[PDB]
Design a protein around this ligand. Structure first.
Ligand SMILES: CCCCCCCCCCCCCCCC(=O)OC[C@H](COP(=O)(O)O[C@H]1[C@H](O)[C@H](O)[C@H](O)[C@@H](O)[C@@H]1O)OC(=O)CCCCCCCCCCCCCCC
Ligand SMILES: CCCCCCCCCCCCCCCC(=O)OC[C@H](COP(=O)(O)O[C@H]1[C@H](O)[C@H](O)[C@H](O)[C@@H](O)[C@@H]1O)OC(=O)CCCCCCCCCCCCCCC
Ligand SMILES: CCCCCCCCCCCCCCCCCC(=O)OC[C@H](COP(=O)(O)OC[C@H](N)C(=O)O)OC(=O)CCCCCCCCCCCCCCCCC
Ligand SMILES: CCCCCCCCCCCCCCCCCC(=O)OC[C@H](COP(=O)(O)OC[C@H](N)C(=O)O)OC(=O)CCCCCCCCCCCCCCCCC
Ligand SMILES: CCCCCCCCCCCCCCCCCC(=O)OC[C@H](COP(=O)(O)OC[C@H](N)C(=O)O)OC(=O)CCCCCCCCCCCCCCCCC
Ligand SMILES: CCCCCCCCCCCCCCCCCC(=O)OC[C@H](COP(=O)(O)OC[C@H](N)C(=O)O)OC(=O)CCCCCCCCCCCCCCCCC
Ligand SMILES: CCCCCCCC/C=C/CCCCCCCC(=O)O[C@H](COC(=O)CCCCCCCCCCCCCCC)COP(=O)([O-])OCC[N+](C)(C)C
Ligand SMILES: CCCCCCCC/C=C/CCCCCCCC(=O)O[C@H](COC(=O)CCCCCCCCCCCCCCC)COP(=O)([O-])OCC[N+](C)(C)C
Ligand SMILES: CCCCCCCC/C=C\CCCCCCCC(=O)O[C@H](COC(=O)CCCCCCCCCCCCCCC)COP(=O)([O-])OCC[N+](C)(C)C
Ligand SMILES: CCCCCCCC/C=C\CCCCCCCC(=O)O[C@H](COC(=O)CCCCCCCCCCCCCCC)COP(=O)([O-])OCC[N+](C)(C)C
Ligand SMILES: CCCCCCCC/C=C\CCCCCCCC(=O)O[C@H](COC(=O)CCCCCCCCCCCCCCC)COP(=O)(O)OCCN
Ligand SMILES: CCCCCCCC/C=C\CCCCCCCC(=O)O[C@H](COC(=O)CCCCCCCCCCCCCCC)COP(=O)(O)OCCN
Ligand SMILES: [Ca+2]
Ligand SMILES: [Ca+2]
Lengths: 389, 389
């Protein structure tokens, strides 16, 4: 009856259960109350709204379809490896990921003019958007740390927290920064400098974020998780502390990617993990350059903020499927993350037939082959340093 | 730890498990194989299709979104009370129901011209569709049994099979046929006769379908379900019989709606069941009359064929939630069925402001009140006949 253990491990990694429930009204379902709310809200909107403007009806209908799909997600979609701060938030994150996957599926069938029209419908200002370090100055160097460098620091902090490896994080950091420098040489869009991508991105933002993530990860590993109930706390300070720590992990998994005597499927799964990581880093660059929008546009940072949100559970589910011998099935969030990464790659290839010439396409392919080979060399070096030191 | 029993009963009525699996390759998941298939098919379509015609791109993208949402349904959506012939078919039925619910949500925000344009886009021929029994003849009476009378017979057979009650079925049959006769008097659209709805619909089609459904239900109750494996059958005839009986119920539930000493929530839940039944019968009539399409159009019989498909699990889940004391949550298919019924009612009210005048609206409201009162009287009479005879 090992199939019992297999399906229970799949439910452990796919729909985690809330343990030691003390305040029971956060976890008792009220789906008939939700049905009445749904029907009454849709009734109020149907019978009171003004449906005279035909382009507002479409926008409101889209927003309402998204909202009630999130409701359906809360009701029916899987929860993931996380139960904190509430499993319903992760059900809604999964529903958003499914919506994005279906949006990419639909996008793969239009032509470029239809996609540009679909974009100008969202932000009409996107119609007019278009695509020196010899005078070195400390002021201009320090002026590089904008809000996006802050976001990049924190994204690398989250990545290092989840991955728990200096080697993988630094490998991906250096390889992607060099790839981006190469692409900015191939495309005249570059404006900042060499030194930015060489020092102020690898060493300071990415490196510091990785350091912070690894420190916080070691802290969360070495600590004891004794959760008292909010009802049992008698001080107000303890109540506020418990309510704010409800937004932190209840427990922490010990993550080791390479064992001393590792198999071949293990190293191959780690290599595929690093390759999909590089691919998701390429998707951002190429979506930004194909459909011309800036980094400050809600498309850019919205997609970048959603990809990290769905990256958090995906790493845990991938690590479980890779290492846990009894997890005989891939989590559904990891499945959707993989399909979203590959569909974004296909979208960039389909509508990206204008970016490069044939010689530039040759150079891009040769560089991507060299990057895959260098990633493999770094992975082998990590395996060797592990199984010897 | 009664919450364990509560959630296990919810999983019994919401995601039923396949028992005694002998041919294991119909039930082992292959979601990475499905991921590779998804990506390769979408890649082949993206890189080979002709995206020159802009109105074919939208149609193909819609169809592909539906297909891959059905894939996501197979992966993530609940199964229902049924595991026969395969739980994935019922996951896909649930996904279609979710799609229809979201379509109604979207429809509630457009105006009437936008809905008519959305319809003429589907079937351009819908632009030109527009809204004697004193010479009695046996030939004209027998000529009434078209393919739709056949479908109605079989729909009532399925309803009687699931409900397991002559009283409820005959009550709904007579009340709805009288309501439809009243509405066809209020609307000059009538063409057939009095005698059709009085004799050839209540007595022959509905009555005969109910009789057949009750006979088949008693048969399925009194029989023993010994399922041998397809591998263990040694004759070819037995193999074909097992393969064709894989499309029949594996077991049958004994259904009794009224106990001798029933509560008030029990009778109230049965009354609500009958009222939602009447409402779903009204939705068909009014969708057909608001948006003018014939009964032979794929909209009419397609929606009528999908509503029965999702009616099959909904009745079982409603009966479980009503009668089973440990089923502390409503099944998700029953939830979606209820929201679809009420949303179709809201859609008919929103776009149906043209069908009736104010006096006709008064007559419709008075008739619906009388119908609710007569349904309650019939339910009380059934309760009395049960608790006395
Ligand atoms: C503060 C929160 C108030 C209460 C929250 C309670 C809750 O969060 O419960 C979630 C349940 C299902 O999850 P849950 O029962 O835990 O697990 C299910 C699992 O059994 C399935 O097998 C699996 O497939 C999975 O998808 C799950 O559906 O949904 C609901 O009731 C939400 C309606 C609340 C709305 C109340 C009024 C709103 C309008 C006014
Ligand atoms: C003849 C059929 C071949 C094999 C069928 C196997 C199967 O039907 O399995 C279904 C599983 C998940 O169900 P299942 O594991 O039974 O139950 C899950 C439950 O554990 C969850 O908790 C719950 O949330 C629920 O939604 C379920 O997802 O999906 C799949 O693998 C389908 C991919 C097959 C495609 C194979 C190649 C296609 C391209 C070529
Ligand atoms: C909607 C989402 C908003 C936050 C969700 C949320 O507050 O979780 C609700 C929590 C309930 O904690 P508990 O019953 O003591 O145990 C939970 C389980 N043992 C755990 O530690 O995971 O509630 C709390 O303990 C803290 C209440 C803060 C509510 C802030 C909103
Ligand atoms: C635009 C759309 C974007 C939508 C995306 C939003 C999702 C944001 C997610 C990013 C948070 C990154 C935090 C890193 C992280 O992994 O912690 C996530 C924690 C998970 O708690 P857990 O159940 O105890 O996990 C135990 C498991 N064994 C483990 O090892 O970890 O759970 C947490 O503590 C995270 C709390 C974040 C606060 C969310 C508030 C939202 C309310 C509205
Ligand atoms: C895709 C859906 C197509 C039909 C699904 C289907 O054929 O079910 C697969 C069945 C497998 O039966 P089993 O392993 O003996 O036991 C099942 C369980 N014990 C039950 O009786 O429910 O397979 C069979 O037993 C009959 C095979 C016919 C396949 C026709 C297609
Ligand atoms: C346009 C879109 C429309 C899509 C809708 C399609 C759904 C059709 C459903 C209507 C079938 C009505 C049959 C009546 C019925 O209820 O039997 C349904 C059976 C269920 O089997 P089970 O798991 O053993 O149920 C045991 C449970 N305890 C019970 O008492 O019943 O399961 C069955 O036996 C039904 C088999 C029907 C054949 C389906 C083939 C589809 C393949 C493609
Ligand atoms: C033109 C340019 C040219 C460029 C050329 C480039 C060429 C480079 C090409 C490289 C191709 C390399 C192929 C190697 C494949 C071998 C894999 C393997 O066997 O390991 C297996 C698992 O492997 C898996 O887990 C697969 C699951 C993945 C599906 C989800 C995707 C989501 C990813 C999310 C990533 C998120 C990252 C985001 C981080 C921010 C190991 O497991 P097992 O031992 O087999 O046993 C099964 C598991 N149990 C039983 C133990 C439980
Ligand atoms: C203008 C014209 C005017 C007209 C006026 C008209 C006015 C008429 C208005 C009539 C309104 C009557 C209201 C009566 C409500 C009382 C209900 C009650 O208490 O019973 C309760 C359940 O009740 C429920 O189950 C509710 C769940 C329903 C939600 C899903 C909808 C899907 C329906 C699918 C129908 C499919 C049919 C399709 C068939 C083909 C009983 O249960 P409980 O004892 O409370 O305990 C809970 C359950 N446990 C604990 C035992 C497990
Ligand atoms: C190309 C790989 C196709 C081979 C395949 O998937 O069969 C699988 C390879 O299984 C493996 O050994 C892992 C390697 C697959 C990782 C590649 C996914 C990326 C797809 C992007 C390609 C774009 C170009 C065979 O295993 P499975 O049983 O079919 O799947 C396991 C499913 N459960 C059991 C986990 C549910
Ligand atoms: C109006 C009824 C609203 C009252 C309500 O739903 O609270 C519920 C009435 O619960 C009942 O007693 C059943 C009666 C409700 C049937 C009406 C549904 C049709 C909605 C169409 C209205 C259109 C006009 C209270 O119970 P609940 O805990 O909130 O829900 C139970 C949820 N689980 C436990 C089953 C998951
Ligand atoms: C939810 C958790 C997800 C957090 C991941 C953040 C992603 C990091 C990121 O990509 O940075 C930027 C993302 O932008 C943001 O998310 C801004 C939000 C700042 C605070 C975020 C956390 C608090 C993208 O800008 P860029 O042009 O790519 O510049 C990067 C190097 N020049
Ligand atoms: C899947 C199982 C669902 C089967 C339910 C069928 C619904 C029955 C029905 O409504 O009949 C008709 C449905 O049409 C059909 O489904 C035709 C299919 C015939 C065979 C169906 C079963 C085999 C609707 O026509 P109408 O104009 O409403 O006439 C009715 C009285 N004049
Ligand atoms: Ca950079
Ligand atoms: Ca009729």
């Amino acid at each position: 009856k090992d199939d019992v253990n297999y399906k229970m491990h799949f439910r452990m990694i796919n729909e985690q259960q809330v343990e030691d429930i003390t305040i029971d009204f956060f976890y008792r379902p009220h789906t008939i109350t939700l049905l009445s709310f749904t029907i009454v809200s849709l009734m109020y909107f149907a019978f009171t709204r003004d449906d005279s403007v035909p382009e507002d009806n479409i926008w409101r209908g889209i927003l309402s379809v998204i909202f009630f799909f999130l409701i359906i997600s809360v009701l029916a979609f899987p929860n993931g490896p996380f139960t904190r701060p509430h499993p319903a938030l992760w059900r809604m994150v999964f529903g958003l990921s499914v919506l994005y996957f279906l949006f990419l599926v639909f996008l793969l069938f239009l032509n470029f003019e239809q996609v540009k029209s679909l974009m100008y419908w969202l932000d009409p200002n996107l119609r007019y958007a278009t695509r020196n370090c010899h005078v070195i100055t400390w002021e201009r160097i320090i002026s590089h740390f904008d809000i996006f460098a802050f976001g990049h620091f924190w994204g690398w902090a989250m990545k290092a927290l989840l991955i728990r490896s200096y080697g993988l994080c630094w490998t991906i950091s250096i390889t992607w920064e060099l790839t981006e420098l190469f692409f900015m040489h191939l495309l005249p869009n570059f404006a900042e400098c060499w030194w930015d991508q060489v020092i102020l991105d690898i060493l300071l933002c990415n490196g510091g974020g990785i350091w912070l993530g690894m420190v916080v990860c070691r802290f969360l590993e070495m600590r004891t998780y004794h959760w008292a109930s909010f009802k049992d706390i008698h001080t107000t300070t303890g109540k506020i502390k418990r309510a704010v720590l409800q937004f932190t992990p209840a427990s922490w998994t010990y993550v080791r990617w390479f064992d001393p005597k590792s198999s071949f499927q293990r190293v191959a799964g780690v290599y595929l993990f690093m390759i999909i990581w590089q691919l998701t880093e390429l998707n951002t660059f190429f979506l930004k350059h194909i459909f011309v929008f800036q980094a400050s546009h809600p498309l850019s940072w919205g997609r970048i903020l959603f990809i990290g949100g769905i990256t958090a559970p995906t790493v845990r589910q991938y690590y479980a499927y890779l290492t846990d011998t009894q997890c005989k099935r891939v989590g559904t969030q990891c499945w959707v993350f993989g399909v979203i990464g590959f569909l974004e790659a296909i979208v960039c290839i389909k509508f990206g037939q204008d970016l490069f010439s044939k010689t530039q396409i040759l150079y891009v392919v040769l560089w991507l082959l060299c990057v895959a080979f260098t990633t493999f060399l770094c992975l082998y070096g990590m395996i060797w340093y592990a199984e010897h030191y």
